[PDB]
Amino acid sequence: TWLTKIVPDLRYRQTRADFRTAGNLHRKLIRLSSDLGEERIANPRQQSGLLFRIEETRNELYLLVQSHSPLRVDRLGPGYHGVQMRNLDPFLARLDKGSRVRYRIVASPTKRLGRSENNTQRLGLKRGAAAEEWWHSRAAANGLELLSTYAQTLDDVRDPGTADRSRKIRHPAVRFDGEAVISDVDAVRHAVLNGIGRGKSYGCGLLSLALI
Amino acid sequence: TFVDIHAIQTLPYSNINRDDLGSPKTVVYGGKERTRVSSQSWKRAVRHEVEARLGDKAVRTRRIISEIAKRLRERGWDADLADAGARQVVLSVGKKSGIKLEKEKDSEAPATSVLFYLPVPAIDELAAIADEHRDAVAKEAAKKTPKGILPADRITEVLKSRNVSVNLFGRMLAELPSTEVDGAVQFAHAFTVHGTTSAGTFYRYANVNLDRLVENTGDAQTARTAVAEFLRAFLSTVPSTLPDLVHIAVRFDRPISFAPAFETALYGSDGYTLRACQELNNYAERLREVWPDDAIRGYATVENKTDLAALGERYDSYPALIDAMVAAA
Amino acid sequence: TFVDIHAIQTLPYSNINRDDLGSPKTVVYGGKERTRVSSQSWKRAVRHEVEARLGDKAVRTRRIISEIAKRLRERGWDADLADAGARQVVLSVGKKSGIKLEKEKDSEAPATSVLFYLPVPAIDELAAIADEHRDAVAKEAAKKTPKGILPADRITEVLKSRNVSVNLFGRMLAELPSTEVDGAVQFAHAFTVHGTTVEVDFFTAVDDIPKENDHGSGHMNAGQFSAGTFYRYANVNLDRLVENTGDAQTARTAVAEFLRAFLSTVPSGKQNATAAMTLPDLVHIAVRFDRPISFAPAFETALYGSDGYTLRACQELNNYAERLREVWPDDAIRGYATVENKTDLAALGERYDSYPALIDAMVAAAF
């Protein structure tokens, strides 16, 4: 995998595209990668596949893509290929186990339930914590972290009209931030490259580390 | 007349008090970020411990109307008689219109927009003063817009009822400047001694102005017990392990903090407890030889390796150190 | 004859004196924001400390009528006779119309529209002159619109009574230009030596009576805090101080206690919730015979960090004092104490051992 910083702007002066919706946003994220491979197995985490992090949404969007395919500049983008681009190996200095490395993990804590007049549904809420248990339970014995659970709202997603393109729903995303402790190198490595959680096309999953 | 307390305590990889977005609160000290625990949090844990042992229950709340109504319902009053009663107790106090209230709801009893801090016997006695005028309250409830009928003098004297937590931490009430008591214990924020951007070794400090504390409480034995339990609760409690270094000093001129000793962050890859200990020692020595004063100094340590000279005479344990220092005060 | 005092003091994460909205006062110096402690705040702490030791109690007030009436009620006068008496004492000095008073509607005595600054024995003496004319006061109270009956010369002589805080800090009174005394100590604002951004601090007040469906937070706000290494400076014009005090030994005691209070004290602004009691990490007293001089320009170029700020600021003040001393040569006295024995500060004079020793040798050496 490798890392790049990008900033997408609105096509015209009437916000016809792209920031108007989330489906076009991820559309602008897949368009940049023409060639795409996709290998699946019975319910593991997906590795196809891109990862991105939205920092701020007040200047059309500030975004950071970490992925495997090379990102290519398109219409109404930065004044260069980037903002910035470089390769990165989770092999550098091996990311020594037992050594501390900072991190920034997005998430979407959920628990699934049977709902009346359903057609079972998943629910973003799982008094005294439950999301700590949820993420450190999914967070198998690799780099353990801290759990910064929040208590607010909200994220929406609607369709621009294209077929086979998700419609309108909401989803909460918790922004955990801290200093990962590495207890397993290949497990945290493969877990970062895959992406942590479902809906990798909506921002969740991306993990970035740092040094002491 | 100032009981100063310093303590180095290593808090593990956790999140003591998160920020408004989940992250831990951080300072920018000496150029570097430093996770910190707000003073209001430790003050809350400490008081809850003090009141825990000394079961005074200095309840800090807004919904005083609901509890006054509860005491009146326990003592025979009807739901409407209790509710209207409590509202008479609150509306007959100050500034021409009683204590202001929040945007009332259609069914729930309102809550004062200002916030109160009282012990449980204070609420009980307030409900008692409300019960002595049953007929008056019922007569006022007959109207559409009632007014004050309660003897504001005695209820106002009940709101002035102090407590151990009220004495140490102080109270404020804008609509009742007669009950405002000033705190006697200066509690400082706890920042790490090394830049972290969660575990680490926090440094903590607090001052106890004996003079004002004896002034609020009045007696001197109650004051001595209150400060002793304060110190023990300050070391013992931890928000929702013991400090690796404890230094109590009694100063007769002015309180002093050792925070500047930890301005230049400490680099690691090694341990931080010994470095912080010997560096606090060094700063206490040079500061001691630059601001000469006749003070009392004592300290405890959970490691007998180093000898801290400037910190006084090394007592054996925390309760012994605290006992000898509160005694010497 | 100018006792200059410089001091580098590092205050931790606190908020000494907030602005009109919670934020700490900030300067824009050398292009970067720098939190500051207003001069009046330190002057207030200093005076309260000086007068604390030297128990003169130079009370600044508006309600002098209230205390004159209180002294008269203590000395036997009735409530109405005491109140009318005090109003005569205040109404018998103001030229052409008496001392202006803010529109008074209350059962309490009126508060003068100008702030007085007097010691307690002065108020006592005013009550004495008011007590010597009981009958006259009653005679004025008998009318509907009374006037002045007191001998404005001696009461005017009581209002001119100076004091240690009055001598050092000075007084102003527009309605009585004869009592205006000029200050002798130039106090400067204390700005950081390094650019500091204000960190907003979120905080809540939890309720002790919970209700299901809610965690029960009783209040929320966010107070702006900031930490840093402040630079502080003050000058003492000996000449004018000896003029105000009159004697030279009393003057000597007042300036010595001033310097000690300037180093010792720290304000009381939101310190209860954050103890910021500290001592200056560097203290430099110099006695100059030509003009006072500040070391503020040394700190114009803000200091970048990630390191400490005490050592760099100390040695940089040294460098600036050295070059400045060799560019403006003068026969002055210099001494300094320091809470760090690493560097050797040459240009600051002879390194004394401790703050009170430095203060003693400099106040003595100043004359």
Same-domain pairing of A48 and A106: no
Residues C263, C355 contacting (CB under 8 angstroms): yes
Instruction: List Cβ neighbours of B286 (8 Å cut-off, separation of 6 or more).
Output: C339, C340, C341
Q: Please confirm whether the linkage preceding A18 is cis (ω < 30° from 0).
A: yes
Q: Which residue of B has its CA nearest to C271?
A: B186
Residues C269, C17 contacting (CB under 8 angstroms): yes
Is the Cβ pair B257, C273 closer than 8 Å?
no
Q: Which of B189, B254, B260 sits opposite C10 (nearest CB)?
A: B260
Q: Kindly state the helix (H) or strand (E) to which residue B42 belongs, with its residue range.
A: helix B39-53
- Nearest Cα neighbor of B262 from B293, B287, B231, B289 is B287
A65 to chain B, minimum CA–CA distance in Å? 23
Is the Cβ pair B30, C308 closer than 8 Å?
yes
Q: How many other CB atoms are found less than 10 A from the CB of residue C187? A: 20
β-pairing, B296-301 vs B245-251, is antiparallel
Instruction: List Cβ neighbours of B196 (8 Å cut-off, separation of 6 or more).
Output: A179, B33, B34, B35
Same-domain pairing of A100 and A171: yes
Helix (H), strand (E), coil (C) string for C284-328: EEEEECCCCCCCHHHHCCCCCCCCCCHHHHHHHHHHHHHHHHCCC
Q: Which of A102, A149, A179 sits opposite B22 (nearest CB)?
A: A149
- The single-letter code of the amino acid at A208 is S
Q: Kindly state the helix (H) or strand (E) to which residue B121 belongs, with its residue range.
A: helix B120-131
**CA–CA distance, C285 with C361 (Å, rounded to integer):** 10
- Burial status of residue B271 (CB atoms within 10 A of its CB: 0-12, 13-18, 19 or more): exposed
Query: What region, left, alpha or beta, does residue C8 occupy, with left being phi > 0 and alpha being psi -120 to 50 degrees?
Result: beta
Same-domain pairing of A111 and A84: no
End-to-end CA distance of chain B: 7
- Nearest Cα neighbor of B171 from B163, B161, B158, B182 is B182
Distance of CA B123 to the CA centre of its chain: 20
How many contacts, defined by CB atoms under 8 Å, are there between B and C?
Answer: 140
- Nearest Cα neighbor of C29 from C238, C143, C190, C203 is C190
Q: Which of B27, B30, B183 sits opposite C309 (nearest CB)?
A: B30
- The single-letter code of the amino acid at B144 is K
Question: What is the maximum alpha-carbon separation in chain C?
Answer: 77
Please indicate if any CB of chain B lies within 8 Å of the CB of A172: no
Same-domain pairing of A7 and A43: yes
Instruction: List Cβ neighbours of B275 (8 Å cut-off, separation of 6 or more).
Output: B266
Q: What is the CA radius of gyration of chain C?
A: 25
Backbone angles phi, psi at C264, to 5 degrees: -60, -60
Record the tokens describing residue B244, joined without a space. 């690796």
Q: How far is CA A38 from CA A30, A47, A49, C244, C331, in A?
A: 13, 7, 8, 90, 84
Instruction: Tell me which chain A residues have a C-beta less than 8 angstroms from the C-beta of B197.
Output: 102, 179
Q: How far is CA C343 from CA A183, B4, B46, C212, C339, in A?
A: 45, 30, 42, 62, 11
- The single-letter code of the amino acid at A121 is Q
End-to-end CA distance of chain A: 22
Record the tokens describing residue C178, joined without a space. 């004869």
- The single-letter code of the amino acid at A52 is F
C143 to chain B, minimum CA–CA distance in Å? 34
Q: Which residues pair with B27 in a beta bridge?
A: B34
Record the tokens describing residue B130, joined without a space. 């409300």
- Nearest Cα neighbor of B140 from B107, B98, B103 is B98
Tokens 């049953």 belong to B134
**CA–CA distance, B174 with B203 (Å, rounded to integer):** 34
Residues B267, B194 contacting (CB under 8 angstroms): yes
- Burial status of residue C58 (CB atoms within 10 A of its CB: 0-12, 13-18, 19 or more): buried
- Nearest Cα neighbor of B99 from B124, B79, B81, B118 is B118
Interface of C with B in 299-328 (CB under 8 A): 304-311
Is the Cβ pair B32, C205 closer than 8 Å?
no
Backbone angles phi, psi at C46, to 5 degrees: -60, -55
Cα torsion at B231, B236, B238, B241 (round to 10°)?
140
Instruction: Tell me which chain B residues have a C-beta less than 8 angstroms from the C-beta of C271.
Output: 186
Chains within contact range of chain C (3+ C-beta pairs < 8 Å): B
**CA–CA distance, B158 with B145 (Å, rounded to integer):** 26
**CA–CA distance, C39 with C188 (Å, rounded to integer):** 6
What determination technique applies here?
cryo-EM
Q: Which of A102, A148, A179 sits opposite B22 (nearest CB)?
A: A148
**CA–CA distance, B222 with B229 (Å, rounded to integer):** 11
β-pairing, C350-351 vs C333-338, is parallel
Q: Which of B25, B188, B291 sits opposite C354 (nearest CB)?
A: B291
Q: Among positive and negative, which fits the CA dihedral B42, B48, B53, B58?
A: positive
Total structural domains within chain B: 1
How many contacts, defined by CB atoms under 8 Å, are there between A and B?
Answer: 25
Instruction: Tell me which chain C residues have a C-beta less than 8 angstroms from the C-beta of B28.
Output: 196-197, 199, 227
**CA–CA distance, B41 with B48 (Å, rounded to integer):** 11
Tokens 């006072």 belong to C292
Residues A135, A68 contacting (CB under 8 angstroms): no
Please indicate if any CB of chain B lies within 8 Å of the CB of A179: yes
Instruction: Tell me which chain B residues have a C-beta less than 8 angstroms from the C-beta of C279.
Output: 256, 287, 290-291
Same-domain pairing of A38 and A9: yes
C326 to chain B, minimum CA–CA distance in Å? 29
Is the Cβ pair B15, A146 closer than 8 Å?
yes
Count of residues making up chain C: 367
Mapping DSSP to helix (H, G, I), strand (E, B) and coil, where does residue C49 land? helix
Interface of C with B in 19-78 (CB under 8 A): none
The upper half-sphere exposure of residue C343, i.e. CA atoms within 13 Å in the direction of its Cβ, equals: 20
Record the tokens describing residue A16, joined without a space. 């016809």
Record the tokens describing residue C202, joined without a space. 């979120």
Is the Cβ pair B13, A150 closer than 8 Å?
no
β-pairing, A111-113 vs A207-210, is unpaired
Q: How far is CA C250 from CA B34, B226, C163, C244, C258, in A?
A: 48, 43, 11, 11, 12
**CA–CA distance, C95 with C92 (Å, rounded to integer):** 8
Buried b (16+ CB within 10 A) or exposed e, B97-119: ebbebeeeeeeebbbbebbbbbb
Same-domain pairing of A131 and A143: yes
Instruction: List Cβ neighbours of C195 (8 Å cut-off, separation of 6 or more).
Output: C32, C33, C34, C302, C303
Instruction: Tell me which chain A residues have a C-beta less than 8 angstroms from the C-beta of B196.
Output: 179
Cα torsion at C350, C355, C357, C362 (round to 10°)?
60
Q: Which residue of C has its CA nearest to B28?
A: C227
Is the Cβ pair B13, A181 closer than 8 Å?
yes
B269 to chain A, minimum CA–CA distance in Å? 9
Is the Cβ pair B198, A174 closer than 8 Å?
no
Same-domain pairing of A40 and A116: no
**CA–CA distance, B65 with C209 (Å, rounded to integer):** 12
Instruction: Give the domain extent around A59.
Output: 1-90
End-to-end CA distance of chain C: 8
Q: Which residue of A has its CA nearest to B268?
A: A212
Is the Cβ pair A146, B14 closer than 8 Å?
yes
Q: Kindly state the helix (H) or strand (E) to which residue B205 belongs, with its residue range.
A: strand B200-209
The upper half-sphere exposure of residue B207, i.e. CA atoms within 13 Å in the direction of its Cβ, equals: 25
Is the Cβ pair B18, A148 closer than 8 Å?
yes
Question: Helices B134-141 & B79-91, crossing angle to 10 degrees?
Answer: 90
**CA–CA distance, C24 with C16 (Å, rounded to integer):** 7
Same-domain pairing of A212 and A115: yes
Identify the domain boundary among A90, A116, A138: A90
Record the tokens describing residue B137, joined without a space. 């309250």
Helix (H), strand (E), coil (C) string for A59-108: CCCCEEEEECCCCCCCCCCCCCCCCEEEECCCCHHHHCCCCEEEEEEEEC
**Entry resolution in angstroms?**
3.7
**CA–CA distance, B285 with B279 (Å, rounded to integer):** 10
Q: Which residue of B has its CA nearest to A128?
A: B240
Residue of A100, A102, A144, A146 best to disrupt the B interface, most CBs of B under 10 A: A146
Residue of B263, B283, B286, B289 best to disrupt the C interface, most CBs of C under 10 A: B263
Same-domain pairing of A50 and A118: no
DSSP, res C230: E
Q: Which of C12, C14, C354 sits opposite B289 (nearest CB)?
A: C354
Instruction: Tell me which chain B residues have a C-beta less than 8 angstroms from the C-beta of C337.
Output: 290
Residues C38, C189 contacting (CB under 8 angstroms): yes
Instruction: Tell me which chain B residues have a C-beta less than 8 angstroms from the C-beta of C202.
Output: 19-20, 25
Same-domain pairing of A142 and A51: no
Record the tokens describing residue C107, joined without a space. 């059962």
- Nearest Cα neighbor of C168 from C283, C48, C67 is C48
- Nearest Cα neighbor of B321 from B7, B101, B10, B103 is B7
**CA–CA distance, A90 with A94 (Å, rounded to integer):** 7
Instruction: Give the domain extent around C122.
Output: 1-367
- Burial status of residue A150 (CB atoms within 10 A of its CB: 0-12, 13-18, 19 or more): middle
**CA–CA distance, B86 with B64 (Å, rounded to integer):** 8
Same-domain pairing of A69 and A154: no
β-pairing, C217-237 vs B26-29, is unpaired
- Nearest Cα neighbor of B280 from B36, B6, B62 is B6
Interface of C with B in 102-131 (CB under 8 A): none
A73 to chain B, minimum CA–CA distance in Å? 33
Interface of B with A in 5-24 (CB under 8 A): 13-15, 18, 21-23
Identify the domain boundary among A74, A90, A106: A90
What DSSP string runs through C195-213? Answer: ----EEEEEEEE-SS--TT
